[PDB]
Amino acid sequence: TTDQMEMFRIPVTINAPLQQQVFGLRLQPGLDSVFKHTLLGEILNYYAHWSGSMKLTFVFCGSAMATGKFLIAYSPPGANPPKTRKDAMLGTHIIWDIGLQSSCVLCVPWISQTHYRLVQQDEYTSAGYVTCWYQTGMIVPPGTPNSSSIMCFASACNDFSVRMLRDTPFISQDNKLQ
Amino acid sequence: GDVEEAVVHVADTMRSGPSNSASVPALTAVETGHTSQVTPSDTMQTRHVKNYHSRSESTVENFLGRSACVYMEEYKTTDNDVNKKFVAWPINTKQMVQMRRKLEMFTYLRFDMEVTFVITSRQDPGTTLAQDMPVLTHQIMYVPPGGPIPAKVDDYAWQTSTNPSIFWTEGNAPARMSIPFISIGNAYSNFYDGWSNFDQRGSYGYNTLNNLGHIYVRHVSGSSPHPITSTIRVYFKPKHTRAWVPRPPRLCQYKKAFSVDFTPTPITDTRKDINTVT
Amino acid sequence: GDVEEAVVHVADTMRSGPSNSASVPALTAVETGHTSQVTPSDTMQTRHVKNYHSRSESTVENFLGRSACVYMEEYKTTDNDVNKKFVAWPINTKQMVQMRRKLEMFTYLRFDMEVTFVITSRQDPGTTLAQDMPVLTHQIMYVPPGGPIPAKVDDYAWQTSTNPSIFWTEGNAPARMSIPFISIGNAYSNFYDGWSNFDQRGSYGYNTLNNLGHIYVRHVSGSSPHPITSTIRVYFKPKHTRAWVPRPPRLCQYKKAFSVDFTPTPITDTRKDINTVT
Amino acid sequence: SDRVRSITLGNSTITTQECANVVVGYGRWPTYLRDDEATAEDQPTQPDVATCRFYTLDSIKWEKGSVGWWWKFPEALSDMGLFGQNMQYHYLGRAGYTIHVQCNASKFHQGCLLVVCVPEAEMGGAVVGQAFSATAMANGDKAYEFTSATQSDQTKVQTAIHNAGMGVGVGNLTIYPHQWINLRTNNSATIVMPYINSVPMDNMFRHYNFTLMVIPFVKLDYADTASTYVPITVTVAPMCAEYNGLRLAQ
Amino acid sequence: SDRVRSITLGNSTITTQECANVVVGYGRWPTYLRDDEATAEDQPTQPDVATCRFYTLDSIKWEKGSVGWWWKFPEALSDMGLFGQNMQYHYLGRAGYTIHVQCNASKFHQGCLLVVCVPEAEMGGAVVGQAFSATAMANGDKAYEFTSATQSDQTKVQTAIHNAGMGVGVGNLTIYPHQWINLRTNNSATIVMPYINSVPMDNMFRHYNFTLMVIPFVKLDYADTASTYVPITVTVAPMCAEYNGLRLAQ
Amino acid sequence: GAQVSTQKTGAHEIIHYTNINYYKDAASNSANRQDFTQDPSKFTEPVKDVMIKSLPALN
Amino acid sequence: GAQVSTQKTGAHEIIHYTNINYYKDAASNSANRQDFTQDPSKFTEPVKDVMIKSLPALN
Ligand SMILES: CN1CCN(Cc2ccc(NCc3ccc(C(F)(F)F)cc3)cc2)CC1
Ligand SMILES: CN1CCN(Cc2ccc(NCc3ccc(C(F)(F)F)cc3)cc2)CC1
Ligand SMILES: CCCCCCCCCCCCCC(=O)O
Ligand SMILES: CCCCCCCCCCCCCC(=O)O
DSSP states (O other), X not given: OOSGGGGGOEEEESSOOTTOEEEEEEOOTTTSHHHHTSHHHHHHTTEEXXXXXXEEEEEEOSOTTOBOEEEEEEEOSOSSOOOSHHHHTTSEEEEEEOSSSOEEXXXXXXXXXXXXXXXXXXXXXXXXXXXXXXXXXOBOOTTSOSEEEEEEEXXXXXXXXXXXXXXXXXXXXXXXXX | OOEEEOOOBOOOBOOBOOEEESOOSSEEOGGGSOOOOOOGGGTSOBOOBOOOOBOGGGSHHHHHOSOEEEEEEEEESSOSOGGGGSEEEEOOSOSSHHHHHHHTTEEEEEEEEEEEEEEEEEEOOOSOOOOOOOXXXXXXXXXXXXXXXXXXXXXXXXXXXXXXXXXXXXXXXOEEEEEOOOOSSSSEESOOOSBSSTTSOXXXXXXXXXXXXXXEEEESSOOOSSOEEEEEEEEEEEXXXXXXXXXXXXXXXXXXTTOOOOOOOOSSOOOSOTTOOO | OOEEEOOOBOOXXXXXXXXXXXXXXXXXXXXGSOOOOXXXXXXXXXXXXXXXXXXXXXXXXXXXXXXXXXXXXXXXXXXXXXXGGXXXXXXXXXXXXXXXXXXXXXXXXXXXXXXXXXXXXXXXXXXXXOOOOOOOEEEEEXXXXXXXXXXXTTOGGGSOSSSOXXXXXXXXXXXXXXXXXXXXXXXXXXXXXXXXXXXXXXXXXXXXXXXXOEEEEEESSOOOSSOEEEEEEEEEEEEEEEEEEXXXXXXXXXXXXXXXXXXXXXXXXXXXXXXXOO | XXXXXXXXXXXXXXXXXXXXXXXXXXXXXXXXXXXXXXXXXXXXXOOOTTTSSOEEOOOBOOOTTOOOEEEEETGGGTTSHHHHHHHHHEEEEEEEEXXXXXXXXXXXXXXEEEEEEEETOOOOBSSSSOOXXXXXXXXXXXXXXXXXXXXXXXXXXXXXXXXXXXXXXXXXXXXSSEEEEETTTOSEEEEEEOOOOSSSOXXXXXXXXXXXXXXXXXXXXXXXXXXXXXXXXXXXXXXXXXXEEEOSOO | OOSOEEEEETTEEEEESSOOOOEETTSOOOOOOOTTTOOOOBOOBOOOTTTSSOEEOOOBOOOTTOOOEEEEETGGGTTSHHHHHHHHHEEEEEEEEEEEEEOOOOTTOEEEEEEEEEETOOOOBSSSSOOOOTTSSOOSSOOEEOBSSOOOOTTSBOOBGGGTTTTBXXXXXXXXXXXXXXXXXXXXXXXXXXXXXXXXXXXXXXXXXXEEEEEEEXXXXXXXXXXXXXXXXXXXXXXXXXEEEEOSOO | OEXXXXXXXXXXXXXXXXXXXXXXXXXXXOOOTTOOOOOTHHHHOOOSSOXXXXXXXXX | OEEEEEOOOOSOOOOEEEEOOOSSBGGGSOOOTTOOXXXXXXXXXXXXXXXXXXXXXXX
């Protein structure tokens, strides 16, 4: 990414190979680079334990005449992440239809063997994966751009909580400031 | 009656079954600036769960209710340079990065303060170290703005008649003390987007509102035949805290103690591609 | 009312006389997995005895309610090696055999903790020992998992703003402190028969569930002209204890701090023959 | 607005912002078998949220020359999730279905599709008086294509579209439960099919309960656009499924 | 007579005419998870009679020189019936078990077996300070044999019988739930084990809930008979099983 | 002039402590970290017209 | 807010002590080593059917 602002946009195209992957990421709100510096990850980085559900909101920022459908699925922890839409659809997922309402939400339920999870997540306290796939594809009429973008928003539900106040590792100094 | 007798768990999860209706909680519009209030019960079947988790440890009082070092300096009992035998620190909370960032998450703060002082001494190296010295004693002086400032260790200003002071002897517990809310305004300001002069000139930023005074420290009367060096650490612990207007945490490393100057930094780290998850 | 006013002796022995009947308490069948509940009154004539003995001292609370050392390490005030001037210990209860065996008699435990620190200092031998040093001071830092770790004695991480710390001066009482139940699960696990990865690979055993953090110790600012060595001992004392699923005490000597590995050992000692009683 | 619909089964949800009403079989909602109609004696299993959830089959392409496609159930879902395993391990089965078909296009496209569920869609062979295997009409989740011209190969079914492979007028399929996907005003069709059979329960590997058919009555058309085809996706969700007669799998 | 017992789970039944009493864990009967102790939010599946039924593992031979055997659960049942499939397709699981061991011999045979369930039976390697794979202690339904002499191969667990591979006296295993099979008066042992763990639910592929051990304390003996060995068979039946967290299988 | 109040403990497992003030300045009192009231509406729902989650956000 | 309770003593030979809690966390309280309840049935009689000591174990 030669341009930093490009990090916030997920590319999309018109003639996509059927059932292609849009994006994939690990669900480590306090450790993964994706969620590390977000408004939520920053708060979690001051703590050691966390629990509760999370919200992921996606907004389509294409043309008004564009249309399409997308499948967004959450895969609980396992030995292998999904590789295809058939594998992905077995877990929790929602079918998103783009229309007048430009945004859809995907509540990631709290499914875990322990009441709490470590911010410095490991194999024992893994949380799973989240992926998005083309459901029908994007179709546009004549005289419109051939590409579009999507944005994602992250926030915590009303059952979220944290514990064990600790010092964040993102900030450090070598000499006294003057 | 010689006694006066003076908890809020997170929300529970309600059971939800299959649904098929025109109501669509999932779809919303972020353009309104409104954060969706959906819950997992609104998009999938869920069991009834009684949740006893509480957000007690996430309150601002507990978050800021921890003592943190804000300054350290060294001073010698005896030396040729007069300025090197005592310390003079203008009070400010921007010196140390951890506490600076913790405080800078809010625009305005209002709290009482609890100050603790940790003092340690060590004998400087030399060719001849054999000596006997009784226990040392230290004096901490606080000078509100505009008061007289000592120019040497044995200055007359050290005879405080109105300025509060603490005398401490090595080997005992660290000194501790309380300070009320002493701001001329209704709340402390971590940021100030303005100038000092009315014609938009002069000093700029939070440096304009820093008028808390000074702190001075010295050895009361200790003067060893050989030099001895002492170090003092100051710890602040807000109490009875209130905060307003939260702001995003800082991302770039600090570079100045009285300015917001910074160097551009990448948003976050990179990975092989958008699909890499391993 | 400004006050609130808030014992079980062992069983007695009942008098028994001669008997001749079809009831046979003596004969039973161990194949059922049932331990016989017979008493001496059921197999011989006995007098009436009132017994006042109590099992107060055998409760788990009292059995585990004793402070026991769990770790010691040495660090020097000054030396060429940076790593030798401070300590860094990952918290675990498997280091010392007595407490390890005492805890390992149960599968799951749930208790509060009381931690006490004993610190002593001594001057290292050398060709020149004459020096004068004031009293030393020590800092104990606790870093929950994932927090920053200092890399040297004078690192910035020692400016704790959220990490709890204790400053202690030699000559006073040992430092003491309390810790609540801080396990992510519902109870501590002394044993874990499982793997880390979902495909049955990686780390195996109780090492997988040890994520309690680290403890760091240093001399605050002491730096003597000649080396001085200090030792710290950590003592744990469970409080408000609860235990489940007792298991047989260990028989083989421990050999690893993070494994159950052992060497085969004889069941017990021998004697001349089955009839020898002298 | 009544043009937005949301369906939640198990741990999956379907949301459509552009849809028509929902057709419910013959006016009967799926339900469990009653005590006074059952014949088997041993307790039935009721895998609840594990089998009753949406399962998206593979997607197809809609070109200007497409003629139609069909799927046979539950052979289509025979190897999907725990539903397939439970089918394999049991002798008798019973479940209703919810069928959702997705197809979206811009306002400058035109076309009309017919979505219909045909119970007991018996089909005849291309060469009259010549048998076909169980591969020319069902091979898992893959879709089978109709043909404009008369079929000639003896090893597969007669795919004449205008006869629908059943010897009946294609235009008379409206009698069965159905819906239309008109690109002017619609993007999806939803049909709820109850369990229809002559016996309380039946083996799902031997008997095809019903067949799903998609026929373009008005061919797709467009002009001066970069989009060359309109994908179609099908999603199905068993409802009130219960199985009986545990045997060795297969 | 109290010497006859009958157990009926699902579509299977166990009848014994020669048995002792039944031991119930620590006095707790298996039960479903309560609402005020659960942590996961989504509805749990309750495959009832499909997973809760007796499953007979392979049989072993008892010779004059046998030393003992052990099995680890639920890895033993990992590939059995629908229980294995449901384990594979879910992230979290929870279930109690009923263990039945069969061993019969004439009135002229002599021997004593100890049947015990050891929760969290962590084992150490033969060569101290050398790791072992997940194949020297569990490979499905096959039984693993103890050894009279000290184990020497570094790739497998220490099989010293008198230490039981746990560094403890073999004679002190009586503390755990157990029963004895004495050929004089017994032919089978029955143990009901509730769910024991430090968390409400756990993954069954990563964690071994408990281990089953059979040790001959008194070696088998006989004289002048045509029977050369006494087979032993083990039967297990999950109880009140419920799973959560549907993901792709494996 | 002694206050009696409950102390933090578990969910369902004499949980009282006494406090007395010795100084004449309220700034000398101990931290009042026993308050657990909160309201995220000011930041999550700053809109003028109330919006229902079930109904469409717009029209 | 002071608790008064008896202290350990002999069998038949002012046996009261007062306790007050100073901290707001229950983890700071002293050990509650005055509980003496116990029940060995869970480990000694884990059988399903109750067996009487007087009657024969089997038949
Ligand atoms: C930039 N930050 C604005 C808010 N301000 C809060 C604050 C106000 C006063 C103090 N006083 C500390 C103190 C100094 C000297 C003594 C003396 F020893 F003289 F009595 C006692 C307390 C601290 C912080 C912080 C800066
Ligand atoms: C293997 N054993 C599992 C149970 N675990 C119990 C346990 C939990 C926490 C502690 N914390 C000790 C402690 C460390 C640091 C401080 C600090 F000084 F940082 F405040 C205070 C207390 C001990 C035991 C033991 C291991
Ligand atoms: C400067 C105050 C010193 C207080 C000394 C401890 C309390 C002694 C009195 C007993 C408590 C009663 C207090 C009250 O009446 O509210
Ligand atoms: C932080 C608590 C300090 C308590 C000081 C000692 C007790 C003084 C008050 C006298 C006892 C009465 C207590 C009560 O009302 O329950």
